[PDB]
Design a protein around this ligand. Structure first.
Ligand SMILES: Nc1ccn([C@H]2C[C@H](O)[C@@H](COP(=O)(O)OP(=O)(O)OP(=O)(O)O)O2)c(=O)n1
Ligand SMILES: [Co+2]
Ligand SMILES: [Co+2]
Ligand SMILES: [Mg+2]
Ligand SMILES: [Mg+2]
Length: 870
DNA sequence: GCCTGGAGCGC
DNA sequence: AGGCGCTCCAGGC
């Protein structure tokens, strides 16, 4: 023959200009150049694929009644061949009778049956999804994407090595990739598995933008990028993260580079190119883009701002070869990340903002916040006003560029820190979806691609793509009534391991085993074998076991362990995510009856577990969906854990796969209400001993809509409660401090910082009808209608309550911090805070404590108690 | 007092 | 472009 190997990373298509074709960009070894180069493979002839559902008896449309002659594959074949094919302009077409299974929303479809498969060019017309005929009642695949068909049929599951049999060269190059080939047909393409993945060429960039003096615009005057041509994903980030780097700067228009700048750059030997203009930077950049030809281009908030502005600034400055951004040669340049992903199609865009939004939690996900919390370092924020100045002296521009060179070094280390790539890879290789799509976030799609591959492989007719917070549509998890109170004696936290994924298998809940048509469907007959969905979850559970069982190995490749830990986490998020999409109204595999059955059993399973743990003379004090809080009443740790391993074993004993576990043990517990509670957690260390760490749940103290001053104050009180000290020593400590907090708010010693209450706007400040009494929206209209920047939906506004001298309600007395200090009439509303922030949280924390209460707390805070109740 | 919805968390 | 469960706080009548 003649075959070649290529590792793909991104797949693209243009169902409108080139139906039937799918472009795949990846990497290829060039033995002569001892290195992987980019590579584009063109796959032609991916034919539509439709299934026609035969009727029991033939029908006649002009009457809408039966005829009497049964149907056969010959019948249908003919009707299409004769009326259908001919009428919709179908020239060539091949068919064949096949047998397919189905288990979905479309009633009047047999679980199994014989369809007439039909394949014809993607170029020919595409039929009406609702078509019907003399011989057939329905027809699927009528709109199946070319990239779907290809991926499903070839059993491709995310990045992996492919074999292209009988490749063709191309005279006219269509991409910007070093290598290019063409595949004559979908089946010349074959997945291979015994091959390690190839390193990647990753480029980390950052940019600076300046608004112009006269005309309104966003001119990019600088750009930094770090580069690694060997950034592996089947192993640990590299040390260093980059191998080479480049800088570029340009004067906006009406400014000159300080003098001696050229010679100060030559002086300190920095790889920085001084660009004479905006176009000269854009063109210098695309030039580099194209030469380093990075598979993965990383940045900060890319699909939101940074990218939109890079492409529009190439449209304005009429830059040379815009697509050199992406990997495909193209002519027109779209605009608004759809229009954007496409501009970079063939290349993967890692956005450290959205990735983190997915791997951890923070108050705000903007770089500075992220660098700090993740790298444990401070990041200098340089305003756009200080910029024009910087250009006055050679030292300042050199700093604004050493600054942009840093961001690109936080982003590549932020990325490098969370293993966002080696993780993304696997989440994909597990669901078989598309990696670039993964890094773009979204669980729902990844689910779909996992069930499709599942259902194809198992000869199922998959549901056609549908071309188009809410009120709960069915019962969910169970919450046990909490036995409010403070606990001194040890508490046992027993919590089920993957309660939903397990429940799905344990009871064989699957599209293919549960009978359905609001009611809770009946569990499948234990006779049936494992449906597909369960069998899927099982592979996950099994492969995961295999890994956590490899981690126990000795004299093993050290770094491997970091890896095994990633796959394992992936093997879990996956599984636990399966449940969700089952209940999502827009998920291709909507199936409400199942999602219901799954939580129906969970409720049941959690109830019994409680009834049991009680028939065991142990008091259950709280339970949330699948967890159990037990009061051991023992102060003897060793004794707890045994009581622990005991309950476990008595429970596990009840299921084939379900398994509960000692999730943990609390030194003391403050249980306020459902979903709200504090706790000292037990973290054993060197045997015979342990150390304690405080864990808060649902407390106002955790939320964002409260001022520090209160959260702090609240925090301390919780701290003293779970504390060791006596009850009287605590009540005292609490009184002592509150008192002090009051007085310190009255003598304005409390940094206005604290009072600063924060909130976010779900709509733009102008979108509100009853705006006036909403302090966060009202303070925003000020800002928006006062200075430059403008607050819009999704943003948080900082305000504080003051004394207007307008006897208006507190709500209507919200001023930006800035405005409180810069004006003299505005004074902080000590009265508000002491009674609308501090006394409402501390009060609730103490509700169960004897010795502290509403009325007492007020008097302490220096408020008028008489106005309060117990 | 009675009865909605967002926020925002928990799982 | 995954569920439902529970405070709480507003708000309209
Ligand atoms: N973000 C979440 C968290 C939980 N759940 C549902 C499905 C879980 O099966 C069940 C229990 O929540 P857990 O926090 O206990 O998650 P798991 O039980 O699945 O894992 P673990 O074995 O660690 O308890 O609640 C969910 O739908 N979405
Ligand atoms: Co409500
Ligand atoms: Co009210
Ligand atoms: Mg659990
Ligand atoms: Mg749980």
């Amino acid at each position: 023959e003649q075959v070649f190997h290529f590792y793909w990373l991104d797949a693209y298509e243009d169902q409108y200009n080139q139906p039937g074709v799918v472009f795949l960009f990846g990497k290829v070894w060039i033995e002569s150049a001892e290195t992987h180069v980019s590579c584009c493979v063109m796959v032609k002839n991916i034919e539509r694929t439709l299934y026609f559902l035969p009727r029991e008896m033939k029908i006649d449309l002009n009457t809408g009644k039966e005829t009497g002659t049964p149907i056969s594959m010959k019948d249908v074949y003919e009707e299409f061949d004769e009326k259908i094919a001919t009428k919709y302009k179908i020239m060539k077409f091949k068919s064949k009778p096949v047998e397919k299974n189905y288990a979905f929303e479309i009633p009047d479809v047999p679980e199994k049956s014989e369809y007439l498969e039909v394949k014809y060019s993607a170029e020919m017309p595409q039929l009406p999804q609702d078509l019907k005929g003399e011989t057939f009642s329905h027809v699927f695949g009528t709109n199946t994407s070319s990239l779907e068909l290809f991926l499903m049929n070839r059993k491709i599951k995310g990045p992996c090595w492919l074999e292209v049999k009988s490749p063709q060269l191309l005279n006219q190059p269509v991409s910007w990739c070093k290598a290019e080939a063409m595949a004559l047909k979908p089946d010349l393409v074959n997945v291979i598995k015994d091959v390690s993945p190839p390193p990647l060429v990753v480029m980390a960039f950052s940019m600076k933008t300046m608004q112009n003096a006269k005309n309104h615009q966003n001119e990019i005057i600088a750009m930094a990028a770090l580069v690694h041509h060997s950034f592996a994903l089947d192993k640990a980030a590299p040390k260093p993260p980059f191998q080479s780097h480049f800088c570029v700067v340009s004067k906006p228009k009406d400014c000159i580079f300080p003098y001696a700048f050229k010679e100060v750059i030559e002086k300190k030997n920095v790889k920085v190119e001084v660009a004479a203009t905006e176009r000269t930077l854009l063109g210098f950049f695309l030039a580099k883009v194209h030469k380093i030809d990075p598979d993965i281009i990383v940045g900060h908030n890319i699909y939101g701002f940074e990218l939109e502005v890079l492409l529009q600034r190439i449209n304005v400055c009429k830059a040379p070869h815009w697509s050199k951004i992406g990997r495909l040669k193209r002519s027109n340049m779209p605009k608004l990340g759809f229009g954007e992903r496409n501009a970079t199609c063939g290349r993967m865009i890692c956005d450290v903002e959205i990735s983190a939004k997915e791997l951890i939690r923070c108050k705000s996900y903007h770089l500075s916040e992220l660098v700090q919390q993740i790298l444990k370092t401070e990041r200098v924020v340089i305003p756009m006003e200080n910029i024009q100045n910087m250009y006055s002296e050679s030292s300042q521009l050199l700093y604004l560029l050493e600054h942009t060179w840093k961001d690109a070094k936080f982003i590549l280390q932020i990325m490098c820190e969370l293993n966002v790539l080696p993780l993304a890879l696997q989440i994909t290789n597990i669901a078989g979806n598309i990696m670039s799509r993964t890094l773009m976030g979204g669980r729902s799609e990844r689910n779909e691609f996992l069930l499709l591959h599942a259902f194809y492989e198992n000869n199922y007719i998959v549901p056609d793509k549908q071309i188009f917070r809410k009120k709960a549509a069915y019962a969910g998890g169970l919450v046990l009534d909490p036995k409010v109170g403070f606990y001194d004696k040890f508490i046992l936290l027993l919590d089920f391991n993957s309660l939903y994924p397990s429940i799905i298998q344990e009871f064989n809940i699957c599209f293919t085993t549960v009978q359905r048509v609001e009611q809770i469907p009946e569990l499948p007959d234990p006779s049936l074998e494992m449906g597909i969905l369960p069998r899927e979850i099982r592979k996950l559970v099994e492969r995961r076991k295999q890994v956590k069982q490899l981690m126990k190995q000795q004299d093993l490749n050290p770094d491997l362990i970091l890896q095994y830990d990633i796959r394992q986490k992936a093997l879990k998020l996956t599984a636990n995510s399966m449940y969700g999409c089952l209940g999502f109204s827009y998920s291709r595999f909507y199936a409400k009856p199942l999602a219901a059955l799954v939580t129906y059993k969970g409720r049941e399973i959690l109830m019994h577990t409680k009834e049991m743990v009680q028939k065991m003379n142990l008091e259950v004090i709280y339970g949330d969906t699948d967890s159990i809080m037990i009061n051991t009443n023992s102060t003897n740790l060793e004794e707890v854990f045994k009581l622990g391993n005991k309950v476990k074993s008595e429970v596990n004993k009840l299921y084939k796969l379900l398994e509960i576990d000692i999730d943990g043990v609390f030194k003391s517990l403050l249980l306020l209400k459902k979903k709200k509670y504090a706790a000292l957690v037990v973290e054993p260390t060197s045997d015979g001993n342990y150390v304690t760490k405080q864990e808060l749940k649902g407390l106002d103290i955790v939320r964002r809509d409260w001022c520090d001053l209160a959260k702090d104050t609240g925090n301390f009180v919780i701290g003293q409660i779970l504390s060791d000290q006596s009850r009287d020593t605590i009540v005292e400590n609490i009184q002592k401090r509150l008192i002090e907090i009051g007085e310190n708010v009255l003598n304005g010693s409390v940094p206005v910082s604290q009072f600063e209450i924060n909130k976010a706007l779900t709509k733009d400040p102008q979108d509100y009808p009853d705006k006036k009494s909403l302090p966060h929206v009202h303070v925003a209209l000020w800002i928006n209608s006062q200075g430059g920047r403008k607050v819009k939906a999704g943003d948080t506004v900082s305000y504080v309550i003051c004394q207007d001298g307008s006897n208006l309600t507190a709500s209507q007395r919200a001023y930006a911090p800035e405005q409180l200090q810069k004006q003299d009439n505005l004074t902080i509303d000590t009265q508000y805070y002491l009674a609308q922030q501090i006394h409402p949280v501390v009060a609730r924390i103490c509700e169960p404590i004897d010795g502290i209460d509403a009325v007492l707390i007020a008097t302490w805070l220096g408020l008028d108690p008489t106005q309060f109740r117990v």
